[PDB]
Amino acid sequence: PRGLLARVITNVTMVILLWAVVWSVTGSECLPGGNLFGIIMLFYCAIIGGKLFGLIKLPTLPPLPPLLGMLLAGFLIRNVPVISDNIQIKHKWSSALRSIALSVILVRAGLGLDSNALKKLKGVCVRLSLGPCLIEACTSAVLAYFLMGLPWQWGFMLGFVLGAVSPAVVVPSMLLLQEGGYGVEKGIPTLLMAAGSFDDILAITGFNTCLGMAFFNVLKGVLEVIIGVVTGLVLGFFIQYFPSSDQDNLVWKRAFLVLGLSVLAVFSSTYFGFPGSGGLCTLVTAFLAGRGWASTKTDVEKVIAVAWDIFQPLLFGLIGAEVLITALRPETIGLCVATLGIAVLIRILVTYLMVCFAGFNIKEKIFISFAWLPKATVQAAIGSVALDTARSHGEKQLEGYGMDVLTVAFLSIIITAPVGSLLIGLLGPRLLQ
Amino acid sequence: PRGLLARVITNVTMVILLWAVVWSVTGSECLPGGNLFGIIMLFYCAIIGGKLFGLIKLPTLPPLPPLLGMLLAGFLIRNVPVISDNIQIKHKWSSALRSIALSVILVRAGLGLDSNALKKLKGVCVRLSLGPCLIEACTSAVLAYFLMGLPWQWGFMLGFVLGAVSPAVVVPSMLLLQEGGYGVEKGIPTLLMAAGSFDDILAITGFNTCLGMAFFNVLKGVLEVIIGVVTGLVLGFFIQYFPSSDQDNLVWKRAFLVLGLSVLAVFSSTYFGFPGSGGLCTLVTAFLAGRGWASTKTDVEKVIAVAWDIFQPLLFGLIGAEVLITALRPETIGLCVATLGIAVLIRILVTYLMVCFAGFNIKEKIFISFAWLPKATVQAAIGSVALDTARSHGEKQLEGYGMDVLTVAFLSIIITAPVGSLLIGLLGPRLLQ
Ligand SMILES: CC(C)CCC[C@@H](C)[C@H]1CC[C@H]2[C@@H]3CC=C4C[C@@H](OC(=O)CCC(=O)O)CC[C@]4(C)[C@H]3CC[C@]12C
Ligand SMILES: CC(C)CCC[C@@H](C)[C@H]1CC[C@H]2[C@@H]3CC=C4C[C@@H](OC(=O)CCC(=O)O)CC[C@]4(C)[C@H]3CC[C@]12C
Ligand SMILES: CC(C)CCC[C@@H](C)[C@H]1CC[C@H]2[C@@H]3CC=C4C[C@@H](OC(=O)CCC(=O)O)CC[C@]4(C)[C@H]3CC[C@]12C
Ligand SMILES: CC(C)CCC[C@@H](C)[C@H]1CC[C@H]2[C@@H]3CC=C4C[C@@H](OC(=O)CCC(=O)O)CC[C@]4(C)[C@H]3CC[C@]12C
Ligand SMILES: CC(C)CCC[C@@H](C)[C@H]1CC[C@H]2[C@@H]3CC=C4C[C@@H](OC(=O)CCC(=O)O)CC[C@]4(C)[C@H]3CC[C@]12C
Ligand SMILES: CC(C)CCC[C@@H](C)[C@H]1CC[C@H]2[C@@H]3CC=C4C[C@@H](OC(=O)CCC(=O)O)CC[C@]4(C)[C@H]3CC[C@]12C
Ligand SMILES: CC(C)CCC[C@@H](C)[C@H]1CC[C@H]2[C@@H]3CC=C4C[C@@H](OC(=O)CCC(=O)O)CC[C@]4(C)[C@H]3CC[C@]12C
Ligand SMILES: CC(C)CCC[C@@H](C)[C@H]1CC[C@H]2[C@@H]3CC=C4C[C@@H](OC(=O)CCC(=O)O)CC[C@]4(C)[C@H]3CC[C@]12C
Numbered sequence: 001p002r003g004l005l006a007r008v009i010t011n012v013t014m015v016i017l018l019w020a021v022v023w024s025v026t027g028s029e030c031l032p033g034g035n036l037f038g039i040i041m042l043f044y045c046a047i048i049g050g051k052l053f054g055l056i057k058l059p060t061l062p063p064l065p066p067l068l069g070m071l072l073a074g075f076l077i078r079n080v081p082v083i084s085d086n087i088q089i090k091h092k093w094s095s096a097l098r099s100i101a102l103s104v105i106l107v108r109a110g111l112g113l114d115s116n117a118l119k120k121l122k123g124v125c126v127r128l129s130l131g132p133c134l135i136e137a138c139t140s141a142v143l144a145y146f147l148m149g150l151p152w153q154w155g156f157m158l159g160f161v162l163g164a165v166s167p168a169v170v171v172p173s174m175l176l177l178q179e180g181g182y183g184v185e186k187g188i189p190t191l192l193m194a195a196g197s198f199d200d201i202l203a204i205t206g207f208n209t210c211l212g213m214a215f216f217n218v219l220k221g222v223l224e225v226i227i228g229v230v231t232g233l234v235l236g237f238f239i240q241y242f243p244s245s246d247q248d249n250l251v252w253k254r255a256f257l258v259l260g261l262s263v264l265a266v267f268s269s270t271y272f273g274f275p276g277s278g279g280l281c282t283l284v285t286a287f288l289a290g291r292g293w294a295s296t297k298t299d300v301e302k303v304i305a306v307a308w309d310i311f312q313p314l315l316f317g318l319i320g321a322e323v324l325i326t327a328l329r330p331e332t333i334g335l336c337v338a339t340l341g342i343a344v345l346i347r348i349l350v351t352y353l354m355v356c357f358a359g360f361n362i363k364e365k366i367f368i369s370f371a372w373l374p375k376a377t378v379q380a381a382i383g384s385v386a387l388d389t390a391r392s393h394g395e396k397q398l399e400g401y402g403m404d405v406l407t408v409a410f411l412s413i414i415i416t417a418p419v420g421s422l423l424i425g426l427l428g429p430r431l432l433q
Numbered sequence: 434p435r436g437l438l439a440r441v442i443t444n445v446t447m448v449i450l451l452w453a454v455v456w457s458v459t460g461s462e463c464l465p466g467g468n469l470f471g472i473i474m475l476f477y478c479a480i481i482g483g484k485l486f487g488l489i490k491l492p493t494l495p496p497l498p499p500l501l502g503m504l505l506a507g508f509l510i511r512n513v514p515v516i517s518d519n520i521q522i523k524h525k526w527s528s529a530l531r532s533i534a535l536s537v538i539l540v541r542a543g544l545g546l547d548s549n550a551l552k553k554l555k556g557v558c559v560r561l562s563l564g565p566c567l568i569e570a571c572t573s574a575v576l577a578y579f580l581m582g583l584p585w586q587w588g589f590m591l592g593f594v595l596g597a598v599s600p601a602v603v604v605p606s607m608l609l610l611q612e613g614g615y616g617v618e619k620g621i622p623t624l625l626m627a628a629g630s631f632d633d634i635l636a637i638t639g640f641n642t643c644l645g646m647a648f649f650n651v652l653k654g655v656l657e658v659i660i661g662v663v664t665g666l667v668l669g670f671f672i673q674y675f676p677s678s679d680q681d682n683l684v685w686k687r688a689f690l691v692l693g694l695s696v697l698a699v700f701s702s703t704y705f706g707f708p709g710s711g712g713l714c715t716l717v718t719a720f721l722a723g724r725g726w727a728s729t730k731t732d733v734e735k736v737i738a739v740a741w742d743i744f745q746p747l748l749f750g751l752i753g754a755e756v757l758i759t760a761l762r763p764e765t766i767g768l769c770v771a772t773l774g775i776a777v778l779i780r781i782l783v784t785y786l787m788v789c790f791a792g793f794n795i796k797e798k799i800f801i802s803f804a805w806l807p808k809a810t811v812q813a814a815i816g817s818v819a820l821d822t823a824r825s826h827g828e829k830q831l832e833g834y835g836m837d838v839l840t841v842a843f844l845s846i847i848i849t850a851p852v853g854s855l856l857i858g859l860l861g862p863r864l865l866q
Contacts, residue, residue: 001674001677003679006675006676006677006679006680007679007680009675010675010676010680010686013671013675013690014686014689014690017689017690017693017694017697018693020697020701021693021696021697024696024697024700024701024704025529025533025696025700096458100458238446241434242439242442242443242446243439243443244434244436244439246436246439246440247436247439247440247443253443253447256447256450257446257447257450260450260451260454261450263454263457263458264450264453264454264457267457267458268457271457
């Protein structure tokens, strides 16, 4: 009956019951070496890993983010030889589960976005979404040439992979800051959430175009923008009108509609052959339907919030589950760190410059500069795409260049992701109060 | 903006959207001939079938139950030549889905049982669950010998299969009657729900033993009663104490615990080798948990009721999905019809006699006598077990005897399942008012 004892006892039963129930219905998928056993065990390990980082090993002054534990828990499973064969996850299950978690964070960001602030920040959004991304790519190519044997063709390809803000790490931080409030709320959380959502299409277009040259598509990148806007706009108007207050259980009807269409848009676009259209399609759909509701949007986000907590450990467990290749390969990776360090440093400076027009006087520029660091999702999506092509085509010289790209690609998530989440967490309540 | 137009538009969108979403994640399972296409189409056909029987062809006086539509919808799929390979379903996903729906109705029946009435009905419950089951089986064996070539060995086997009350047909009707109330509520709804729950152990024990004799097990049938009581008690006292009001989201925590352990007991018991223990294990577990949840028992009920509505069309659609063998086989089934007709009539008389002790004065006897007719679930599970051994044990003489079991076993589901459900509908509010 004790509160502390009841909480620990209940959770232990509710986790053993989940494994036991699945093992009964499915004959062998829940035994060691099975497909459902790898997913369940990784889900449990990521859950416990986050709890340790913040409740037992919490630093006095800085609150250690739980995102570090989730990546660490997945890293140990993939790299430990004795816990790498009894637990395995199929690539097609990893990719399917990876994209579903991405759509959940996108709809929640757009759904809670305030449209009034977005109207006055039209000019700032395009500058923020174009400045740091393009500038860093050019610097990365120059930095790589003087410190690596990669030519200009492979120098530019690295830059686009490196420079892309991941919404999965900034969006959860912005929403928590906005809920607390600080008496100003100029629109910084809204600006950061919107700008980082559609930055992916710029990066993927350059990577594919550069990859093809080293092996046209310039117009194709523009088409992905048009399709996502048109599909998101037309479908967004059939959610605020057809579902009305007349029907019952409307809370569970407006929640399945937005999430179901978001999943359809993401997976359908990739199948056709123009990925990235669903990246912003689910942003416009939720944003348009978001303005249609002005009384029941409060209870819809609560349903989505519980869903995000389920996919939070699962998403980052999969992200840090393919770093076994570079687990321990000391080959003077100081140059790789040097390229990453300079590129990050240059990105900070340009971000401050791009917001020097008006409004943001002193602290807004500082907070925005340090909030553009995290790089989690897009880096792992196309991190090893180039290396596989080099291996496939039958050559070898290009494979070595691709391996170098992998080292810097995985290094960004390990380094810049946990630091960015930690910095944004404690500096938000200290600059724009 | 119109509710009439909104429901049809909204419901149509919510069914096409579900198919499109599942089709995107799974490449070919959503296409015709796939595994997930059979489950989706069968659920949709059974859904409209229930709506037609009550909104289009509703009789004036007798309300035609949706069960007739659900049984017919699955019947057409399995028998129509052109829609019998376009939609299919694996046996292992039919059996898994069949048992899960059975556990839902058991916990919802046990949860709504009233303890006060059960205390005074010790004598009536045991007599009701023993009288008709044994008496009807004996009459079926005698009638079969004088009207068929089945010897005494096969006569009793047919009787035990034929004599069994299905809880999935009465409990939904009993719960609705109890909720409405009629100013007396002597305990008839509680008597019928409890007595019919544990009637499975006798029917399976007789059928298995009789089949073995024609091919000791009395002791094992006894253990299934003991095992269910022992595990029902220990697992029933760890649910009304640990999950308490201190925990958050307690509504969704107690509903996962009762339903999760009910599924575990049913599937785990079958695997070990003593089925039927989980049938009454989840009945006692849910009843004991109800006694501790004095206040929040009704709040959890709203979630279980919605769960059954999902499995209502799926359960009966699968029930009428294996009648292709006897789709159209005119072989003078009048003897089979005559044997079933006599057995049903004899069952009515004996049930009236068994409850002529006290309490039920005049009208209660008539209502209870006709409320023991519905027979749908247990028949289909063990109906074709005899014929499976006949075509697999190498003997062809016994194949004819097994075929006669299928004719009567499948004929009872078509006839008595809908009539019994319809009979209680228009007779309940006319006898215990
Ligand atoms: C703790 C509360 C929530 C009740 C749930 C208990 C379950 C966790 C128990 C009940 C039956 C047990 C199972 C019954 C027997 C076995 C022996 C063994 O099963 C096997 O046959 C595979 C290995 C072998 O060949 O022995 C492995 C564990 C297992 C499945 C047990 C695992 C744990 C189970 C599911
Ligand atoms: C907080 C922890 C419990 C989260 C889950 C960690 C898992 C990764 C651990 C927990 C229990 C461990 C398992 C305990 C027993 C075994 C059986 C073992 O196989 C043998 O024992 C073979 C020895 C023989 O020849 O008899 C293989 C590893 C495995 C699945 C272990 C692998 C790693 C597991 C799943
Ligand atoms: C605080 C919470 C998050 C801890 C969760 C603990 C789980 C990781 C434990 C609880 C029950 C354990 C399981 C209990 C029974 C078994 C059966 C066992 O089967 C064998 O011994 C394999 C024999 C063979 O080699 O064939 C393998 C480990 C396993 C799945 C255990 C794995 C680890 C489990 C899931
Ligand atoms: C935002 C998207 C939708 C439209 C813009 C796509 C850009 C990413 C493409 C368009 C023109 C491309 C550039 C044009 C040609 C080259 C040559 C390429 O390889 C060379 O340096 C050798 C050139 C030579 O001398 O032949 C280096 C990158 C670069 C600048 C390309 C980099 C990627 C660019 C900027
Ligand atoms: C209606 C509202 C909820 C928007 C959802 C529309 C979907 C129902 C559409 C969008 C993309 C369409 C699919 C894209 C193309 C095709 C052609 C075709 O796919 C194939 O290539 C296999 C058969 C063949 O060889 O042509 C069959 C239908 C399908 C999958 C379409 C089926 C219907 C889909 C899923
Ligand atoms: C209220 C109704 C719509 C519920 C669902 C009924 C389904 C059983 C129907 C609806 C659409 C029908 C399908 C429409 C088209 C086809 C394609 C057909 O294949 C061909 O046309 C091949 C012709 C050729 O050889 O070129 C096979 C049947 C199928 C899947 C039909 C089978 C039965 C379906 C699935
Ligand atoms: C009132 C509600 C319950 C009616 C529900 C209607 C559904 C039965 C319809 C809506 C969308 C239809 C599907 C839309 C697209 C396709 C792809 C289509 O693919 C082909 O043409 C097969 C070509 C080939 O033979 O390879 C087959 C029919 C199908 C599955 C249709 C089947 C019937 C569906 C599910
Ligand atoms: C509640 C459950 C767990 C216990 C009840 C078990 C009964 C269903 C068993 C116990 C003794 C069995 C009977 C004992 C022997 C026979 C002979 C059997 O076959 C014969 O008639 C030939 C006998 C011979 O060789 O002379 C037919 C049924 C019957 C009455 C059996 C039918 C089923 C009975 C009643």
